Amino acid sequence: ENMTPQDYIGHHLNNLQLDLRTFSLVDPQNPPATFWTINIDSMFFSVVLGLLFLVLFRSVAKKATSGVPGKFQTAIELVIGFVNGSVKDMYHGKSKLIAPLALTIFVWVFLMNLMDLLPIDLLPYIAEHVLGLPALRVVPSADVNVTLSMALGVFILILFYSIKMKGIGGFTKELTLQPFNHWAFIPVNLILEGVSLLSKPVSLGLRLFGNMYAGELIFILIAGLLPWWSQWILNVPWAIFHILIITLQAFIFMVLTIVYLSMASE
Amino acid sequence: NLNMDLLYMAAAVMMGLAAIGAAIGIGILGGKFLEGAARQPDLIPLLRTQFFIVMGLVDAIPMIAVGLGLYVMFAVA
Amino acid sequence: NLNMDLLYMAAAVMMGLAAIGAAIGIGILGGKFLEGAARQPDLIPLLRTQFFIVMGLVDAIPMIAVGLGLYVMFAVA
Amino acid sequence: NLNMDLLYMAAAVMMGLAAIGAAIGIGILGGKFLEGAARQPDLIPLLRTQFFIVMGLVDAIPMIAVGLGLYVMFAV
Amino acid sequence: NLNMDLLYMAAAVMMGLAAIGAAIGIGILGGKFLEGAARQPDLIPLLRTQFFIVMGLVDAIPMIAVGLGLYVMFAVA
Amino acid sequence: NLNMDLLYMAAAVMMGLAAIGAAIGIGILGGKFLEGAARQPDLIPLLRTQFFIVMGLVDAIPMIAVGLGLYVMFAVA
Amino acid sequence: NLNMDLLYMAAAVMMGLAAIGAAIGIGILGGKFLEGAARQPDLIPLLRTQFFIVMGLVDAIPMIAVGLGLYVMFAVA
Amino acid sequence: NLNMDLLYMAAAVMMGLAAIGAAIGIGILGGKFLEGAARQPDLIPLLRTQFFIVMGLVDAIPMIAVGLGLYVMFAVA
Amino acid sequence: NLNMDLLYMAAAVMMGLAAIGAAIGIGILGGKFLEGAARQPDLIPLLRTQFFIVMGLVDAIPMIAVGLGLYVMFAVA
Amino acid sequence: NLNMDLLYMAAAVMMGLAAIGAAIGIGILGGKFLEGAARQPDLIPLLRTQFFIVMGLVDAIPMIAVGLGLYVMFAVA
Amino acid sequence: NLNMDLLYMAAAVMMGLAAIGAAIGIGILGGKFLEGAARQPDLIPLLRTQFFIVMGLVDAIPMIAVGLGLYVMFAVA
Amino acid sequence: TYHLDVVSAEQQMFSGLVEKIQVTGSEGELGIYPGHAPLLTAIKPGMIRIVKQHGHEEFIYLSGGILEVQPGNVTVLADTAIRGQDLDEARAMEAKRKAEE
Amino acid sequence: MNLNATILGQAIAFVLFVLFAMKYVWPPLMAAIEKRQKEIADGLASAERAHK
Amino acid sequence: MNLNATILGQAIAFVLFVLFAMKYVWPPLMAAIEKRQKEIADGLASAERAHK
């Protein structure tokens, strides 16, 4: 067993990347710089968690009744309550898509984060020492590319909804006149307001990414730099606090999505 | 060599100043939210909604700083 | 060489000061918003519009700073 | 060589401190604008005129500092 | 190998600015909590709930800074 | 070459600190005029007269600093 | 010579910023405690039990800073 | 050569800190003058008198600083 | 020779930062003490006891900072 | 020899910081003086005496700093 | 060079940060002295004796720094 | 414009719709412009300035009282004589002394 | 750490899960809740009509 | 290094963490039962009494 503590830590920081052109696995010992290598672990957990959310909720929704209320049915109606309560006041237009957009983002992001509570060495053990895989980590949201995918989708939606609900004719006026409104300032005005527009999705993505990266880092540091008796004593309060972090961060991501779009369209 | 010594320091300055900015900003904003919660009870959910709206705007520039500090630390150095 | 080691430092200092400036500015501005929403529930939709009208000018210069920081870091490099 | 990156540093200092100045000054100014707007609700169009009068003075120096940061950065 | 000695300095600046940010942020937040308790002492277990919620937002960035600085000081150096 | 590359820093310090000084000084000073204008609008012209007299005193020294910053940068080079 | 020198300098910056953090944070928090004591004095045994709860949070981060300061001075030497 | 060059930096710091001192100090003092004018408009010629009495003490030290900054920049240079 | 000659600077940073922290913390805390003593003057010997209770917690970190500074000057250097 | 340039820098730091302290402390104190003189304008001769009693203490340490700055520049350098 | 000039710089940092601390702490404390003296103009002897009780503690920890800065300048350097 | 009533316990001094007024509040003079925010304070003895709707400016002396404001409606509850703890104590002692007799 | 083509697959997953909730999870659950609440409305209204 | 100690530490941590969850985070599901009984069950019962 070749694991020195600092070298041991490195293997957590390394992902399970594929190669698009040969379908080969990129090994941790030598990670060349290349964008065309999908992180199998991140995508696998992302899609699996989305599928489990869909399976459970669609299974009971497909069977739902208005009779005697059930145990799991109550949980469904309660999270529908929190989501619909947010949507019900922050949004005012007709659009159908806003509500399921918020719902799926909330639950799916929370599920990505929820994996972080799972013990750090265990499932990578079943990755390496069972199925023969060179590396693993189990929190997709701690990887950049899922968060930027969602955030830049929200960017597409900002453009799309804003142009749909006020047109280019007024969109140009807003993006050029503000904030000083006087015609000599227009060229300088657009420079400021454009990066203002792009800062919204970028901040969404980086905000979520930073929090989850740091959480898994706490587990990595606990496992790598500390002895058993201190591992448990420091890990317990950490996990308890991380519960609050992941709950509020998921809710924040959803709320801010709704709010950005509302600011553009309404 | 000479690279990592300064690249860690760059990241450190970045995320330290970001920590100041975010912590103090949400400190002032949250203190006003809590005097509002003490003053008029049972408007806690509505003021909580406004608090999250404003909080998202406070965290914007600091989270850009945080993300780029993480980039500098674990990508460039 | 030395150029990149100082340029990451330069972008760092500029975006760090931008972060503090913007975050504390909106922190104060939002604090007055929440206190003004506290006493009377009537005009939340009104103050929350004056809030964006002013918050635009708060973020005027810090996004010049952030734009030039990103410019240095990814294009002057 | 050593010349240019120190010029970029000097521009960073000038324009970052301009960011602090122009941000905090209008934080302090606009907060009093909002509480005044929240007290006498008919007067917002009047008080907003006063707000731009004084906003012209607050930004006065930070725009010299930003022009000099841009000048050191690009022109010199 | 001079590389080590700057990394302790770089860790020092992160944890120093993180300590300032978090300490004063929770100072301002908790002071408004205590005046809220001074007015409405039958609400303290409710106001404490709201306080925990706001604190969970205040502490994020400084905890990232401290985590990274501890990492620099021990794993990298 | 070696001589001039530090005079830009001598300029930078003067105008950064003078910018902060002038900006926040006038920020405080104007905030009080708006507060006083909230109680008696008919005293808004009267108070407006006080504002400019005092503002002349507030930004006297910062303009000595801004002037010698421009002197250094464009006459000593 | 100058390796062991700069370790002590690093501990200086670490514990100095920690000192500001703890001192100011408890200054604000304890000031609000005393105003709560002044307004309803027979209520002090309750507010003091909330003060020692929040006060623990405030110094928690400045005390791991201090712990690493003494580590850097005495243990690393 | 540094005996010419550093003296502009040494004057920069003097006339930056003098500017922050004078500007913030007169900002606070003049703001209190303005609110006192708002409550008691009959007393403006009195409060104006005491304002100019008190304001000559705030400037006592910043003008030592600015005079020596001018001296260092031009006399010793 | 530079090794101990910089240790005097290390102690300067450490105990100067401790001085500003302790002085401002005790200043805020004592300000609430005196306003308490003006609202309930028949109460001063109680609140002064509480002031001495919490002033022991404010200084606990600055006093060890000052002690380590004096140690660095007289023992080490 | 080059040493004489650092003595101007040392006096610059010392005297500029004393200017910050002596300006802002009297700013805060005199602002409360005016706020009290607006309230009770028949007590200007009494408050104006207490103001000099306490103002004597505010600027004592700054006066030591300014005297030593002048000593360093003119006598030593 | 390196022996004497850094000792003057260390004294500058000690006796400048002591100026900031000992001036602003007494500004904050004396402002509350002058507010109480406006609410209770019969209590001024009692509040000024409380003010000296508190002021001794505010100044005590900066005076270590001022005396020790004088030590560093004259006895060491 | 807003509906103002100036009233006392014995008689109603004035009423009607008004554009603005200036009143000596406990902390200082204050102008109540149309549709003003809610308010409650004690008011000092002296003249107060009315400008009734259509601009008819007027002076009313009041011996003191309480002022209150809300968006549609505003009122002043005026005292008839100068109220002070010393004067009230004089009246109370006059009652006691008469009671012994 | 490293930018990656993983960003595209996540977009595919995003639109898929949105579509599966849009046409098959939200509409059924909206009707169920509304049916439960319709019982409330109908009941209290019935009592009040009798009262008239 | 011996990695068994890390597994043991993580097992102990997970055990204590789950105890905290069971004793402090499980009871909030009782508030869900209250939301069942009062809104749905008693509301429909009241509606049925109103019909009758």
Residue numbers in the entry:
A (entry chain a): 4 to 269
B (entry chain J), C (entry chain M), E (entry chain L), F (entry chain S), G (entry chain Q), H (entry chain N), ...: 3 to 79
D (entry chain R): 3 to 78
L (entry chain H): 3 to 103
M (entry chain X), N (entry chain Y): 1 to 52
Task: Quote what the paper states about this structure.
A key component in the generation of cellular energy is the F1Fo ATP synthase, a biological rotary motor that converts proton motive force (pmf) to adenosine tri-phosphate (ATP) in both oxidative phosphorylation and photophosphorylation. The enzyme is based on two rotary motors, termed F1 and Fo, that are coupled together by two stalks: a central rotor stalk and a peripheral stator stalk. The central stalk is comprised of subunits ε and γ and rotates during the enzyme’s catalytic cycle. E. coli and other related bacteria exploit an internal subunit, termed ε, that can sense the environment and inhibit the enzyme under certain conditions.
Here we present cryo-EM data showing E. coli F1Fo ATP synthase in different rotational and inhibited sub-states, observed following incubation with 10 mM MgATP. Masked 3D classification focusing on the central rotor highlighted sub-states in which the εCTD adopted either a condensed down conformation or an extended half-up conformation. The maps generated for each of these sub-states showed the position of the εCTD, with local resolution estimates of 4–5 Å. However, due to the likely high flexibility of this sample, it was still difficult to unequivocally assign the position of the membrane domain subunits (a, b, and c subunits) in the maps. To obtain clearer information in this region, a refinement that focused on the Fo motor was performed and produced maps of sufficient detail to enable fitting of the membrane region. In the half up sub-states, no density for εCTH2 was observed, however εCTH1 remained attached to subunit γ. When the εCTD is half-up, εCTH1 provides an additional link between the εNTD and subunit γ, stabilizing the conformation of the central stalk together. When the εCTH1 is in the half-up state and bound to subunit γ, the central stalk is clamped and increases the stiffness of the rotor.
